[PDB]
Structure 1
């Protein structure tokens, strides 16, 4: 449900159930019904677009993704709740909030459509501020290679035969320009050509042209190594309901961690190179990163986990000691 381009601004507006989604030179606007009358909320284009980009790029995963303290999605599996104010203490207390459930490909397609439309040539929602231009003003082009970015899923490990590429066709990021580009030496014995596999992971991450977007690099059954390059701020504040393990590989990241309900800060965690950290399941997080830093995320891709912290079996935090 996309309107024609509006006359002044040039951005279409969108329908998504009882949600209408709009944008001007400064704000993304979301509109919705409750106790009678029309409700609204504004979000700076640059924030909204970055938050929506992550949501789409993460396939919605499973868990809460918060745009601000009013807007966010619940990422149910094949369904996705989009709430406005629901997980906001005073707003439902007011009864002015609104949730609506959706089939994931619908919301996915729509967000992808909004992202195509509201993101100009000058902006890059995958980028850090110093990397891209502004998200402000009337419609002005599309940014093609945000659009033109194929994702190829790792099945065993990058570099391999029937699986995702390395990135030797990607420029080294400014802020990793001091990271060695040398590749491991492989000396296959005679009659074993191509049987041994190794690559430079730090080289691989040095050429990451996105920020805050874990990509799988090693599959050991369910055990996933999904590293990413982190700069500025996590565009959302999110939290899956599985236990994940963070491992800092370079530079540092400050993590804000709070109770997935009200928001109660529970911890402020600062990871420096080499730090290992469990992010429990009953908390949502958001991180800060001055220098572009290399972060290993360690996920467990078994399918019954996020309906298992629910059951009494499994606690939010991984280890008693």
Structure 2
């Protein structure tokens, strides 16, 4: 039962101008309005804006933790070096019927074809990492590309933003101006006064400022590290493009403004709860649920992760703290 590696570039469609692609038994085609998926025995359609926003995340996150559901049918499960792609795996209708379909891939093989899909299907003026009010539209025939938008380098602190050799603070000068929906956020540096010899370990930065300057939405990015404890804050606007079903607990601390989380059962997709978080609110997302957030105004969110690879197995024998 070895992980698959078979992927293929199919033809360009003459009318639409887009290329279609194959990964194992799945095929991917887009037209003016839709991503059209097929697999052995079934088919599915996702509006292309939702699809591209979702694909942007799975790509940027390297398949992330646990389950990335594009929607109630299609998604991926990260096995960390391998990845399952599914239609209906976490949908009771498909599963009670025996109509779910899963294929396990080597992660770099699936990632390579996902990157090609994302590049080909993204048009000039359309940034699938941005909120709708910040960017153009993906509809219609192929028209140029936005490869710059979809190839942004991941930033990850090794220990903390701003430390020597570590991920830098964001400034106008290094290409990171304050986003319009955080135009009022204070931007002063903390006062840092190190004695001679201790410059490298006396360090502080304006985290709210750094987040106010994030050039993408819904992208947890590590700012500070204590062993497996990762503080991954991010700037959120509109809707989280996926329903995340994590294979471990994760916590959200709302830093500004407000987000509402739609919480559904991880396995079935059934609605379970709705969590409203305002500035200072912290809550846990248990491993047995999937969640999707809604943020009207661009807001600052701390996603707190435990990146230990031992946790998933341990949950497969609690699911809540």
**What is the TM-score of this pair, normalised by structure 2?**
0.93
Partner of 2:4: none
1:257 corresponds to which residue? 263
Residue aligning to 2:143: 140
Number of the residue aligned with 2:3: none
Partner of 1:278, secondary structure, is strand
Find the residue that maps to 1:101 and give its secondary structure: strand
Q: 8, 19, 27: which one pairs with 1:12?
A: 19
Q: What is the rounded CA distance, in whole Å, between the counterparts of 1:191 and 1:238 in structure 2?
A: 45
- Name the counterpart of 1:103: 106
Mark the CA change 1:186 to 1:15 in structure 2 (over 3 Å): closer, same or farther: same
Offset at 1:273? 0.1
State how 1:284-303 maps to structure 2 within 5 Å: 284-303=290-309
Matches within 5 A, 1:216-235: 216-235=222-241
User: 1:6 Cα shift?
Assistant: 1.7
Q: Over residues 97-125 of structure 1, what are the superposed CA-to-partner deviations in whole Å (9 max), with x where a residue is unaligned?
A: 32111111111111111001101112111
Task: With the length of structure 1 as denominator, give the TM-score of the two structures.
Answer: 0.93
Cα gap change, 1:195 to 1:89, in 2 (>3 Å): closer
Instruction: Give the alignment partner of residue 64 of structure 1, picking from 62, 67, 84.
Output: 67
Q: Which runs of 5+ in 2 are unaligned?
A: 1-7
Post-superposition offset of 1:134: 0.6
Other structure's SS at 1:268 match: strand
String of CA shifts for 1:251-277, please: whole Å, max 9, x gaps. 000011121122232211100000011
Distance change (3 Å), C-alpha of 1:15 and 1:191: closer
Instruction: Name the CA distance, whole Å, in 1 between partners of 2:92 and 2:296.
Output: 32
Of the three residues 209, 213, 221, the one matched with 1:215 is 221
**1:11-70 CA distances to partner (integer Å, 9 max, x unpaired)?**
100010011110001000001112xxxx32111110001111111111112311111111
Task: Report the counterpart of residue 246 of structure 1 in structure 2.
Answer: 252
**1:8 counterpart SS class:** coil
Aligned residues: 311
Distance (whole Å) between structure 2 residues aligned to residue 302 and residue 101 of structure 1: 22
Aligned to 1:306, the other structure's residue is in SS state helix
Task: State the match for 1:165 in structure 2.
Answer: 168
Distance 1:194 1:99 in 2: 49
Matching residue within 41, 45, 48 for 2:48: 45
Question: CA offsets per residue over residues 51-101 of structure 1, 9 Å max, x none?
Answer: 111111111123111111111112122211111123222223333332111
SS at match of 1:224: strand
| Corresponding residue number in structure 2 for 1:236 | 242
- Residues 170 and 210, structure 2, Cα contact 8 Å, conserved in 1: yes
Compute the displacement of 1:150 (Å): 1.7
Please name the residue that 2:283 is paired with.
277
Offset, 1:148:
4.0
Alignment partner of 1:78 is 2:85? no
Say yes or no: does 1:309 pair with 2:315.
yes
Deviations 1:136-186 (A, max 9, x none): 111111113213412243111111112212111201101011111111111
